[PDB]
């Protein structure tokens, strides 16, 4: 299958494709994004092997294991660290220990990356994570071997704040989720917004509510109260920090309740969410903006995708992604390029470690701590972007504020601004189609002597 | 002293131990902690005393010996991961296999008496849950460890932070304080406490005027936002150092007296109680755990330290190299520690679960193949185990249940002391006629908002009519 290719140097891969008995990941609903990213990693490895300039004569293999969002993030790691006989020795020094994989392209959610890195830190095995944006992953003493090809929530919050300042909104509502992601994102946004003269009218927590399930009446009353507080408030810009799964029920009340006239700002969880934009009924709720990664077109990847031990197989992924092929094709490559550049950074680090140039390499034995040492210093041009790591293990890939325009014949998420993490400044802002009567920029102020705690209000 | 040599003894079923025995990279080398920690050694000795006195018992685990493997885990998780990986290795072998699930493993320890730290408990419990190894922890209190989705085999003999935060919310609701400010330490403990208290207050009709995080040693901004609201009651769910920093700043700033609701971290710590000038910063009310203590533990430590010096005993008889070069003075400071009962109760809970699993009886116990660690989990939930004559039970969430005592700082000659002014057992009961307040006279401070008649609050609950 596609979850394994023999090679000289193996490369672990963890992709989110979905007490006595343990429910396997294959029984959960198939997530298309994970399969797309897995195919991106495989295409990157195949293109590296195709090319005779980078790692010449060296085969780059991989071992891709289906990981879950939370459920299974242990065995995959134990399997990567073990030898070919599925046996991992216990010893104080691992400087001369050779694992099955030399690096892993780690999972996509923050908790899974933390769990994998807490066990990969004992071996200093490199781990480049895509699509994980926790500010806590920037701690290089807690996670010595953890790297990243995406900006953290630092730059996402910065992009949100600059978008607020450009259009002169100093009166915003923050809606977070009950999980640690929403709480951390809301706290970071609040602490940043408190020093740029933008006040938060209030903050509320949405209940944890996975879709396709029967929800209780207490959650319904909580949603009623939250939407009533939104409607009563004079702030007309709402920032939502919640997973892409838990917002279906909440937007239905905003609509059932018929609350109109707000600018919604979306975190990267649900900004480019294709199934959530599939709803096609939120159009009357105002304008939808979202922070995500800039599209980087990978030449030959769309055609490659269209042409195509345990927790290592899925069957409904192809039939699920067939129906999403055209919208994924039009939306471009956002996290795909993150996986691509992670694989290419690992390959360039391996090339530098082996010390070969346009000829057969030395084929020496490689310890993962050596590759981790060499991979911090990679600096190469990939698809007209400079790929190098910050002293905190981050790649400054441009972000993008994207606007939800309902049109299947065009890009479903039209780019309207570009964020540059290196200068922390948002520029190249384009026309935005506003929900107002005459396409005038919506106003979010509490005040045309101070009143209340907020400085913005008088 | 041949003390570290006694961190291991063989038995029919060997227990595991993760204690903070010591305190504090380019190569993958496990760091070594040379500094000595007295609490870790005291808790290890508490576990040792529990195991030995269980072995002495006839009606509990009859005809079988109980061992242990006490392992030094510093506050770092990278040093604690190695003992766990050794715990899950096959007995007599130095390798851990990569099987597809727990049923194929044969761990060398029946259970693990987990780490004291809550973050370390999170890491090791996430690791152990794959193998379904029962791990009961002492002193790990943060609530998210109670999720059976991600911790199917994590137990604890200390109450979670949810119990004390529910008690605090009940105290606020009973006293009429529905307009309060909630603060928490910037670490994970304070953030989780704040997140739990938000939901508790929203359910109980309390609205939070301000919800800030106090940094560990900014604070001026946090105290300014607290003062901006007309809040008379502040809930400070912070650690000892963050609370001490906030209180030092507010003492230096001559901040007005307030009712402080105290977490168990700083309610009793003498670092903040003895801070000069604290008598002018309002009443401190907190909920302190109502638990038993090991009456014969200090005697056990002193006799064991005395007996460890005999060359004959050691000759008849490393994990903690710094544990050998110590004296009784280095450990007698923390002899009367509450967590010793938690360690002792965790060991007794594992012993009772094992005794139930083997279906042993008083006269003897049936002979069968050794049980895997996952066989304990069925008998660890819904389990009643008696510790020191007082019954204890494990919840469906692996949480133990104990009452709480509402305490206040009464000042007499610059010497604050705790007094009983309430009791929480799932429902709060207080005696407010014996609570001495900080106000001009003995009137309860008023911290109220109107829910019905301008919206106000962090969650937009109250109105300024
Ligand atoms: C554990 O994995 C084995 C692999 O042979 C499988 O047969 C068994 O059903 C699994 N047990 C579970 C999922 O409880
Ligand atoms: C190069 O990669 C492509 C995928 O784009 C693959 O089909 C092909 O076999 C590889 N090799 C050559 C020689 O084209
Ligand atoms: C509950 O679940 C059933 C089965 O999916 C569904 O038909 C129904 O609409 C749900 N709600 C109620 C209120 O029964
Ligand atoms: C909008 O939603 C409200 C609240 O349910 C409903 O009463 C009303 O009929 C809906 N439609 C319009 C046009 O207001
Ligand atoms: C998107 O929504 C439409 C309209 O409800 C629906 O028919 C379709 O199945 C959805 N999904 C797609 C196009 O993948
Ligand atoms: C995908 O659906 C088609 C029908 O549209 C069916 O023939 C095919 O077997 C399905 N593939 C699967 C379930 O893998
Ligand atoms: C990477 O290389 C580019 C192009 O030579 C250079 O301008 C840049 O300074 C390098 N970056 C670092 C971090 O060394
Ligand atoms: C909208 O703008 C047009 C074009 O300037 C103008 O004629 C019209 O009066 C405006 N309408 C309103 C309601 O402001
Ligand atoms: C166990 O009993 C022995 C005598 O058999 C006694 O010397 C020892 O102190 C006891 N140990 C305990 C209670 O820990
Ligand atoms: C705090 O609030 C009080 C009451 O409004 C006010 O007198 C005082 O100046 C404020 N600031 C400080 C630092 O106490
Ligand atoms: C208390 O705060 C003051 C004012 O910032 C500072 O000078 C002093 O050092 C602090 N005290 C302690 C013990 O840290
Ligand atoms: C025992 O106490 C002495 C005296 O304070 C101290 O110097 C020594 O380091 C202690 N031993 C330890 C901490 O192992
Ligand atoms: C208790 O266990 C022993 C040893 O297995 C067994 O012989 C005996 O029948 C059991 N019951 C009683 C009542 O002693
Ligand atoms: C298990 O819990 C139930 C429900 O609280 C209780 O009735 C039962 O006695 C418990 N079983 C024990 C303690 O063995
Ligand atoms: C809890 O305490 C109350 C009095 O405050 C008492 O009536 C009740 O029986 C107690 N409940 C339990 C379970 O002990």
From Swiss-Prot, chain A:
Membership in a protein family: Belongs to the G-protein coupled receptor 3 family. TAS1R subfamily.
Domain of life from the UniProt record: Eukaryota
Location within or outside the cell: Cell membrane
Topology versus the membrane: Multi-pass membrane protein
Quaternary assembly: Forms heterodimers with TAS1R3.
Organism: Homo sapiens (Human)
Glycan attachment sites: 50, 214, 258, 278, 319, 379, 438
Extracellular side: 1-458
Its biological purpose: Putative taste receptor. TAS1R2/TAS1R3 recognizes diverse natural and synthetic sweeteners.
GO biological processes: detection of chemical stimulus involved in sensory perception of sweet taste; G protein-coupled receptor signaling pathway; positive regulation of cytokinesis; sensory perception of sweet taste
Main location: membrane
GO molecular function, one term: G protein-coupled receptor activity
Annotated gene: TAS1R2
A cellular component annotation (GO) from this entry: plasma membrane
Name used for this protein in its record: Taste receptor type 1 member 2
UniProt keyword list: Cell membrane, G-protein coupled receptor, Glycoprotein, Membrane, Receptor, Sensory transduction, Signal, Taste, Transducer, Transmembrane, Transmembrane helix
Swiss-Prot record, chain B:
Membrane topology: Multi-pass membrane protein
Glycosylation (residues): 56, 101, 227, 248, 330, 361, 382, 425
Keyword Lipoprotein applies: no
Subcellular location: Cell membrane
UniProtKB keywords: Cell membrane, G-protein coupled receptor, Glycoprotein, Membrane, Receptor, Sensory transduction, Signal, Taste, Transducer, Transmembrane, Transmembrane helix
One record GO biological process: sensory perception of umami taste
Extracellular domain ranges by topology: 1-465
Superkingdom of source: Eukaryota
GO MF term (any one): G protein-coupled receptor activity
Family: Belongs to the G-protein coupled receptor 3 family. TAS1R subfamily.
Oligomer and partners: Forms homodimers or heterodimers with TAS1R1 and TAS1R2.
Functional summary from the UniProt entry: Putative taste receptor. TAS1R1/TAS1R3 responds to the umami taste stimulus (the taste of monosodium glutamate). TAS1R2/TAS1R3 recognizes diverse natural and synthetic sweeteners. TAS1R3 is essential for the recognition and response to the disaccharide trehalose. Sequence differences within and between species can significantly influence the selectivity and specificity of taste responses.
Name of protein: Taste receptor type 1 member 3
Residues of the full protein shown: 23 to 521 of 852
């Amino acid at each position: 299958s596609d979850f394994y290719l023999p090679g000289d140097y193996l490369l672990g891969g963890l992709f989110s494709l979905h007490f006595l008995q343990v429910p396997m990941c294959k029984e959960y609903e198939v997530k298309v994004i994970g399969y797309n990213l897995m195919q991106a990693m495989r295409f990157a490895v195949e293109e590296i092997n195709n090319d005779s300039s980078l790692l010449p004569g060296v085969l780059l293999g991989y071992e891709i294991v289906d990981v879950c969002y939370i459920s299974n993030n242990v065995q995959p790691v134990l399997y990567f660290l073990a030898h070919e006989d599925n046996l991992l020795p216990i010893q104080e020094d691992y400087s001369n220990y050779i694992s099955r994989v030399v690096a892993v392209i780690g999972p996509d959610n923050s908790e899974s990356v933390m769990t994998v890195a807490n066990f990969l830190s004992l071996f200093l095995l490199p781990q480049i994570t895509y699509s994980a944006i926790s500010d806590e992953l920037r701690d290089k003493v807690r996670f010595p071997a953890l790297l990243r090809t995406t900006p953290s929530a630092d730059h996402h919050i910065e992009a949100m704040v600059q978008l607020m300042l450009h259009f002169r909104w100093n009166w915003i509502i923050v809606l977070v989720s009950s999980d640690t992601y929403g709480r951390d994102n809301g706290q970071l946004l609040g602490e940043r917004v408190a020093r740029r003269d933008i006040c938060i009218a209030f903050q509320e927590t949405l209940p944890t509510l996975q879709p396709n399930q029967n929800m209780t009446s207490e959650e319904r009353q909580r949603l009623v109260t939250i939407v009533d507080k939104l409607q009563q408030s004079t702030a007309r810009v709402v920032v939502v920090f919640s997973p892409d799964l838990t917002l279906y029920h909440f937007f239905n009340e905003v609509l059932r309740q018929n609350f109109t006239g707000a600018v919604w700002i979306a975190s990267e969880s649900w900004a480019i969410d294709p199934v959530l934009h599939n709803l096609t009924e939120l159009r009357h709720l105002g304008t939808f903006l979202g922070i995500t990664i800039q599209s980087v077109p990978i030449p030959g990847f769309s055609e490659f995708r269209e042409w195509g031990t345990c927790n290592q197989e899925c069957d409904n992924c192809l039939n699920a992604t067939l129906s999403f092929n055209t919208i994924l094709r039009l939306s471009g490559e956002r996290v795909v390029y993150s996986v691509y550049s992670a694989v290419y950074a690992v390959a360039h680090a391996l090339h530098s470690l082996l010390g070969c140039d346009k000829s057969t390499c030395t084929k020496r034995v490689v310890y993962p701590w050596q590759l981790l040492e060499e991979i911090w210093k990679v600096n190469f041009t990939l698809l007209d972007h400079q790929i190098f790591f910050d002293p905190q293990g981050d790649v400054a890939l441009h972000l993008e504020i994207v606007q939800w325009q309902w049109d299947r014949s065009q890009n479903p998420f039209q780019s309207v601004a570009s964020y540059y993490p290196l200068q922390r400044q948002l520029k190249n802002i384009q026309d935005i189609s506003w929900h107002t009567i005459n396409n005038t920029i919506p106003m979010s102020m509490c005040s045309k002597k101070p009143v209340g705690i907020h400085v913005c209000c008088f | 002293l041949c003390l570290s040599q006694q961190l291991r003894m063989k038995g029919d079923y060997v227990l595991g131990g993760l204690f903070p025995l010591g305190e504090a990279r380019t190569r993958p080398s496990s760091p070594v902690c040379t500094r000595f920690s007295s609490n870790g050694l005291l808790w290890a000795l508490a576990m040792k005393m529990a195991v030995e006195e269980i072995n002495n018992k006839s009606d509990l685990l009859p005809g079988l010996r109980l061992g242990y493997d006490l392992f030094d885990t510093c506050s770092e998780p990278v040093v604690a991961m190695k003992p766990s990986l050794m715990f899950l290795a096959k007995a007599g072998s130095r390798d851990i296999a990569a099987y597809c699930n727990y049923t194929q493993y044969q761990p060398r320890v029946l259970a693990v008496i987990g780490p004291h730290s809550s973050e370390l408990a999170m890491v090791t419990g996430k690791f152990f849950s794959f193998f379904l190894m029962p791990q009961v922890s002492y002193g790990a209190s943060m609530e998210l460890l109670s999720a059976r989705e991600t911790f199917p085999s994590f137990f604890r003999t200390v109450p979670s932070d949810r119990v004390q935060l529910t008690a605090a919310a009940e105290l606020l609701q009973e006293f009429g304080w529905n307009w309060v400010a909630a603060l928490g330490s910037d670490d994970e403990y304070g953030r989780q406490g704040l997140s739990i208290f938000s939901a508790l207050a929203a359910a109980r009709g309390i609205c939070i005027a301000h919800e800030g995080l106090v940094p560990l040693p900014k604070v001026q901004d946090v105290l300014h936002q607290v003062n901006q609201s007309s809040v008379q009651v502040v809930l400070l769910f912070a650690s000892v150092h963050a609370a001490h920093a906030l209180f030092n700043y507010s003492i230096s700033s001559r901040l007005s007296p307030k009712v402080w609701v105290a977490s168990e971290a700083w309610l009793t710590s003498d670092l903040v109680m003895g801070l000069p000038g604290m008598a002018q910063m309002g009443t401190v009310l907190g909920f302190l755990q109502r638990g038993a203590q090991l009456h014969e533990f200090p005697q056990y430590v002193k006799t064991h330290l005395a007996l460890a010096t005999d060359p004959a005993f050691c000759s008849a008889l490393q994990r903690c190299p710094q544990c050998d070069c110590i004296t009784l003075q280095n450990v007698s400071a923390g002899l009367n520690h509450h967590q010793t009962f938690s360690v002792y109760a965790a060991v007794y809970s594992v012993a009772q679960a094992l005794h139930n699993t083997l279906q042993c009886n008083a006269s003897g116990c049936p002979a069968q193949d050794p049980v895997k660690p996952w066989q304990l989990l069925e008998n660890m939930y819904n389990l009643t185990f008696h510790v020191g004559g007082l019954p204890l039970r494990f919840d469906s969430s692996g949480n133990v249940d104990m009452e709480y005592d509402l305490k206040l700082w009464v000042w007499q000659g610059s010497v604050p002391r705790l007094h009983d002014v309430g009791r929480f057992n799932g429902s709060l009961r207080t005696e407010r006629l014996k609570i001495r307040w900080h106000t001009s006279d003995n009137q309860k401070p008023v911290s109220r908002c109107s829910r019905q008649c301008r919206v106000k609050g962090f969650h937009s609950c109250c109105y300024d009519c």
